[PDB]
Amino acid sequence: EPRAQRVALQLVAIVKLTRTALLYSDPDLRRALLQDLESNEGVRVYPREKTDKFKLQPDESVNRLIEHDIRSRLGDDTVIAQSVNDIPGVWISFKIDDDDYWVALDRDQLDTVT
Amino acid sequence: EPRAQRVALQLVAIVKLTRTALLYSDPDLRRALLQDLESNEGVRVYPREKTDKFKLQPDESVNRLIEHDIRSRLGDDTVIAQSVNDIPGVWISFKIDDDDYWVALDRDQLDTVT
C-alpha cells in the first residue's frame, strides 16, 4: 500500500509536470521542448493514435496497485503499459483537450527515481 | 546512500521539469503557468533576489547527503533550505540564464512523493 502509493504519486507528478510544460509551451518552441524533455529529463512524449497497440505490465509485485493509484489521480481512462507498438518502456497515456498523448519513461532510469 | 540518492533524484526531476516548463512557456501564458504549477502540481516558483534570506535544513537523518546528491545534478551553487524569508518549505534554487529562481515545495505534500 504505502510503497505502491509512493511510486504512483511520483509517476503522476512526472506526467502532470510534463503535460503542464506542453500545455503552456510557446507553439514555436513545442518540438524543441519535446527534444529537451527526452534528452535532459528522460521523458519521451508522443502523440497517441487510436490504433496504437499496447501490452499491460504483468500482474506482478505491486503493479496493479500502482496502476489503480495512478488512475485515481490521472483518470480512469488512463492507459498504463510495458510497451506500445512493441516499444518497451513505462508508458502512461494523457490528454490535452481532445488530443491523446503518451509519456514513455525508461524502466532502468525510472528505477533510480522510484 | 540508496534512499538518499532516491529522494535527491526525485527532487531533481521536479526542479528540471518545472524549469523546463518555465523555459519553453508562451510568454503570454507565463503567469498563468505559475498558477497551474502551484495549484495543481503543488510546485511554487518565485523569482529569487540576492537579498532573500534562507535557513538550512538541519543536519539530521540523511539531509546533507540528499543535498550533496541534488548539487551533483543541479549544480554546486544550488541553495537548498527549510525556509526562505522565514517561509517554511522545501526550497531549492535554480537558474535560467542570469535569472535566479526558487522552487518551494510543501514538506507534508512532498513526503507522499518521497
Tab-separated table of C-alpha atoms in Angstrom:
chain	number	residue	atom	x	y	z
A	1	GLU	CA	0.000	0.000	0.000
A	2	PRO	CA	2.496	2.763	1.100
A	3	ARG	CA	5.272	1.860	-1.391
A	4	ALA	CA	2.679	1.445	-4.173
A	5	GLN	CA	1.055	4.814	-3.351
A	6	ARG	CA	4.532	6.390	-3.344
A	7	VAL	CA	5.601	5.105	-6.802
A	8	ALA	CA	2.195	6.055	-8.285
A	9	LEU	CA	2.395	9.609	-6.863
A	10	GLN	CA	5.897	10.027	-8.306
A	11	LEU	CA	4.708	8.838	-11.744
A	12	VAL	CA	1.631	11.127	-11.531
A	13	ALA	CA	3.839	14.145	-10.688
A	14	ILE	CA	6.052	13.421	-13.748
A	15	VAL	CA	3.019	13.136	-16.083
A	16	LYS	CA	1.339	16.286	-14.651
A	17	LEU	CA	4.539	18.351	-14.913
A	18	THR	CA	5.170	17.092	-18.464
A	19	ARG	CA	1.553	17.755	-19.531
A	20	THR	CA	1.807	21.218	-17.967
A	21	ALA	CA	5.016	22.020	-19.853
A	22	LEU	CA	3.390	21.025	-23.172
A	23	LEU	CA	0.113	22.825	-22.342
A	24	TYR	CA	1.690	26.230	-21.657
A	25	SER	CA	4.550	25.939	-24.244
A	26	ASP	CA	5.244	28.594	-26.861
A	27	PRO	CA	3.831	26.940	-30.041
A	28	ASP	CA	7.066	27.859	-31.930
A	29	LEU	CA	9.158	26.049	-29.270
A	30	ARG	CA	6.995	22.995	-28.894
A	31	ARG	CA	9.077	20.492	-30.851
A	32	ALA	CA	12.245	21.889	-29.217
A	33	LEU	CA	10.584	21.394	-25.778
A	34	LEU	CA	9.934	17.710	-26.691
A	35	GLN	CA	13.661	17.232	-27.526
A	36	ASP	CA	14.600	18.838	-24.166
A	37	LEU	CA	12.140	16.583	-22.204
A	38	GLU	CA	13.551	13.467	-23.927
A	39	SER	CA	17.287	14.235	-23.822
A	40	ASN	CA	17.560	16.071	-20.474
A	41	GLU	CA	14.620	14.792	-18.388
A	42	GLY	CA	14.428	11.278	-19.919
A	43	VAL	CA	10.735	11.856	-20.634
A	44	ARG	CA	9.574	10.971	-24.105
A	45	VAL	CA	6.263	12.348	-25.323
A	46	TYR	CA	4.440	11.059	-28.386
A	47	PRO	CA	1.047	11.699	-29.978
A	48	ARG	CA	-1.206	8.719	-29.165
A	49	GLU	CA	-3.226	7.219	-32.055
A	50	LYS	CA	-6.360	5.148	-31.559
A	51	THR	CA	-4.651	2.305	-33.429
A	52	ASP	CA	-1.520	2.288	-31.156
A	53	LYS	CA	-1.294	-1.210	-29.649
A	54	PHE	CA	-0.211	-1.742	-26.073
A	55	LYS	CA	0.791	-4.571	-23.712
A	56	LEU	CA	-0.023	-4.427	-19.974
A	57	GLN	CA	2.618	-4.642	-17.285
A	58	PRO	CA	2.423	-8.061	-15.698
A	59	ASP	CA	0.278	-8.668	-12.626
A	60	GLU	CA	3.426	-8.969	-10.527
A	61	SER	CA	4.573	-7.389	-7.265
A	62	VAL	CA	2.530	-4.195	-6.736
A	63	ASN	CA	1.961	-3.368	-10.429
A	64	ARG	CA	-1.862	-3.450	-10.315
A	65	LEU	CA	-1.986	-1.377	-7.139
A	66	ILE	CA	0.349	1.277	-8.611
A	67	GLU	CA	-1.878	1.392	-11.719
A	68	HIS	CA	-5.032	1.839	-9.591
A	69	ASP	CA	-3.364	4.697	-7.645
A	70	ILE	CA	-2.224	6.319	-10.887
A	71	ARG	CA	-5.801	6.131	-12.368
A	72	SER	CA	-7.361	7.628	-9.216
A	73	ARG	CA	-5.199	10.765	-9.791
A	74	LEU	CA	-4.944	10.991	-13.621
A	75	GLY	CA	-8.325	9.474	-14.568
A	76	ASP	CA	-9.879	6.078	-15.006
A	77	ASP	CA	-9.309	6.048	-18.785
A	78	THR	CA	-5.512	6.300	-18.333
A	79	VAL	CA	-3.674	3.501	-20.110
A	80	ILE	CA	-0.576	2.155	-18.332
A	81	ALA	CA	1.611	-0.321	-20.272
A	82	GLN	CA	5.031	-2.030	-20.551
A	83	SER	CA	5.078	-1.473	-24.322
A	84	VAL	CA	3.370	0.483	-27.060
A	85	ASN	CA	3.631	-0.741	-30.662
A	86	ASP	CA	6.137	-3.255	-29.223
A	87	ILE	CA	8.492	-0.482	-27.914
A	88	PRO	CA	9.403	-1.351	-24.268
A	89	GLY	CA	9.068	1.299	-21.549
A	90	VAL	CA	6.861	2.598	-18.795
A	91	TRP	CA	4.034	4.060	-20.801
A	92	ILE	CA	1.230	6.227	-19.445
A	93	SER	CA	-1.376	7.979	-21.606
A	94	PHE	CA	-2.588	11.513	-21.019
A	95	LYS	CA	-4.818	14.030	-22.769
A	96	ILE	CA	-4.899	17.711	-23.598
A	97	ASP	CA	-8.488	18.587	-24.571
A	98	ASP	CA	-9.320	16.059	-27.312
A	99	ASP	CA	-5.732	15.247	-28.140
A	100	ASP	CA	-4.269	11.971	-26.798
A	101	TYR	CA	-0.611	11.554	-25.872
A	102	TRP	CA	1.824	9.025	-24.420
A	103	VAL	CA	4.561	9.580	-21.909
A	104	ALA	CA	7.257	6.874	-22.225
A	105	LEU	CA	9.849	6.552	-19.458
A	106	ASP	CA	12.915	4.271	-19.492
A	107	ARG	CA	12.410	1.441	-16.959
A	108	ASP	CA	16.050	1.362	-15.690
A	109	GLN	CA	16.248	5.174	-15.458
A	110	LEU	CA	12.864	5.304	-13.690
A	111	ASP	CA	14.030	2.756	-11.041
A	112	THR	CA	16.572	5.276	-9.688
A	113	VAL	CA	13.770	7.857	-9.179
A	114	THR	CA	11.452	5.153	-7.642
B	1	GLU	CA	23.121	6.122	0.350
B	2	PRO	CA	20.351	4.452	-1.798
B	3	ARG	CA	17.375	6.153	-0.072
B	4	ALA	CA	19.235	9.496	-0.097
B	5	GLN	CA	20.105	9.142	-3.809
B	6	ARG	CA	16.452	8.272	-4.493
B	7	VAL	CA	14.937	11.336	-2.741
B	8	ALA	CA	17.530	13.639	-4.377
B	9	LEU	CA	16.788	12.245	-7.871
B	10	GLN	CA	13.053	12.761	-7.322
B	11	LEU	CA	13.635	16.377	-6.211
B	12	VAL	CA	15.991	16.969	-9.186
B	13	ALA	CA	13.365	15.624	-11.632
B	14	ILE	CA	10.733	18.019	-10.175
B	15	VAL	CA	13.081	21.042	-10.464
B	16	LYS	CA	14.205	20.110	-14.023
B	17	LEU	CA	10.623	19.573	-15.226
B	18	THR	CA	9.491	22.839	-13.599
B	19	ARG	CA	12.453	24.791	-15.039
B	20	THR	CA	11.720	23.245	-18.441
B	21	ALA	CA	8.054	24.267	-18.304
B	22	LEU	CA	9.025	27.880	-17.494
B	23	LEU	CA	11.840	27.921	-20.089
B	24	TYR	CA	9.669	26.891	-23.052
B	25	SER	CA	6.437	28.669	-21.890
B	26	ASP	CA	4.483	31.050	-24.101
B	27	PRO	CA	5.454	34.469	-22.612
B	28	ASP	CA	1.735	35.488	-22.582
B	29	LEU	CA	0.876	32.369	-20.517
B	30	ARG	CA	3.764	32.524	-18.113
B	31	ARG	CA	1.973	33.868	-15.045
B	32	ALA	CA	-0.953	31.500	-15.748
B	33	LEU	CA	1.561	28.587	-15.921
B	34	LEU	CA	2.880	29.601	-12.447
B	35	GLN	CA	-0.694	29.464	-11.022
B	36	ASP	CA	-1.165	25.990	-12.592
B	37	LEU	CA	2.184	24.693	-11.147
B	38	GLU	CA	1.232	25.975	-7.667
B	39	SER	CA	-2.437	24.936	-7.513
B	40	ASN	CA	-2.346	21.645	-9.465
B	41	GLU	CA	1.237	20.357	-9.090
B	42	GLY	CA	1.933	21.854	-5.626
B	43	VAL	CA	5.074	23.484	-7.027
B	44	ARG	CA	5.545	27.128	-6.202
B	45	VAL	CA	8.004	29.156	-8.247
B	46	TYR	CA	9.296	32.568	-7.219
B	47	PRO	CA	11.927	34.970	-8.546
B	48	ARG	CA	14.987	34.725	-6.266
B	49	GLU	CA	16.559	38.018	-5.094
B	50	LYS	CA	20.138	38.311	-3.885
B	51	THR	CA	18.802	39.662	-0.586
B	52	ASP	CA	16.424	36.672	0.024
B	53	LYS	CA	17.460	35.124	3.355
B	54	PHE	CA	17.446	31.387	3.873
B	55	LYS	CA	17.793	28.823	6.682
B	56	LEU	CA	19.424	25.413	6.075
B	57	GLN	CA	17.655	22.142	6.727
B	58	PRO	CA	19.085	20.624	9.873
B	59	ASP	CA	21.992	18.188	9.719
B	60	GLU	CA	19.628	15.360	10.620
B	61	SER	CA	18.944	11.928	9.133
B	62	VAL	CA	20.180	11.962	5.510
B	63	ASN	CA	19.609	15.687	4.839
B	64	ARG	CA	23.239	16.541	3.984
B	65	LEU	CA	23.601	13.518	1.718
B	66	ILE	CA	20.386	14.377	-0.177
B	67	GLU	CA	21.691	17.948	-0.603
B	68	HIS	CA	25.048	16.689	-1.953
B	69	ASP	CA	23.235	14.411	-4.455
B	70	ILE	CA	20.972	17.276	-5.514
B	71	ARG	CA	24.012	19.610	-6.091
B	72	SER	CA	25.859	16.968	-8.145
B	73	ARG	CA	22.902	17.007	-10.615
B	74	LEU	CA	21.678	20.651	-10.495
B	75	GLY	CA	25.000	22.406	-9.777
B	76	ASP	CA	27.207	23.192	-6.836
B	77	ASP	CA	25.766	26.704	-6.395
B	78	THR	CA	22.254	25.310	-5.752
B	79	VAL	CA	20.810	26.540	-2.471
B	80	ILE	CA	18.677	24.024	-0.547
B	81	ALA	CA	16.784	25.327	2.519
B	82	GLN	CA	13.944	24.717	5.021
B	83	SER	CA	12.847	28.358	4.766
B	84	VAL	CA	13.290	31.458	2.658
B	85	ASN	CA	12.483	34.865	4.167
B	86	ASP	CA	11.118	32.817	7.101
B	87	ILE	CA	8.529	30.982	4.894
B	88	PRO	CA	8.777	27.216	5.691
B	89	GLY	CA	9.080	24.693	2.849
B	90	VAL	CA	11.486	22.599	0.859
B	91	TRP	CA	13.280	25.266	-1.095
B	92	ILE	CA	15.688	24.683	-3.969
B	93	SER	CA	17.163	27.448	-6.139
B	94	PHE	CA	17.549	27.218	-9.894
B	95	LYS	CA	18.579	29.498	-12.743
B	96	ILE	CA	17.523	30.355	-16.264
B	97	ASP	CA	20.429	32.210	-17.910
B	98	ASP	CA	21.183	35.049	-15.466
B	99	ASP	CA	17.827	34.937	-13.753
B	100	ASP	CA	17.608	33.238	-10.325
B	101	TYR	CA	14.511	31.416	-9.104
B	102	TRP	CA	13.220	29.372	-6.172
B	103	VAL	CA	11.124	26.256	-6.228
B	104	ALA	CA	9.206	25.856	-2.935
B	105	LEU	CA	7.528	22.521	-2.196
B	106	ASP	CA	5.224	21.759	0.756
B	107	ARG	CA	7.025	19.410	3.189
B	108	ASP	CA	3.942	17.262	4.055
B	109	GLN	CA	2.850	17.023	0.397
B	110	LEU	CA	6.415	16.167	-0.675
B	111	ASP	CA	6.608	13.287	1.880
B	112	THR	CA	3.918	11.359	-0.041
B	113	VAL	CA	6.014	11.598	-3.253
B	114	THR	CA	9.241	10.671	-1.309
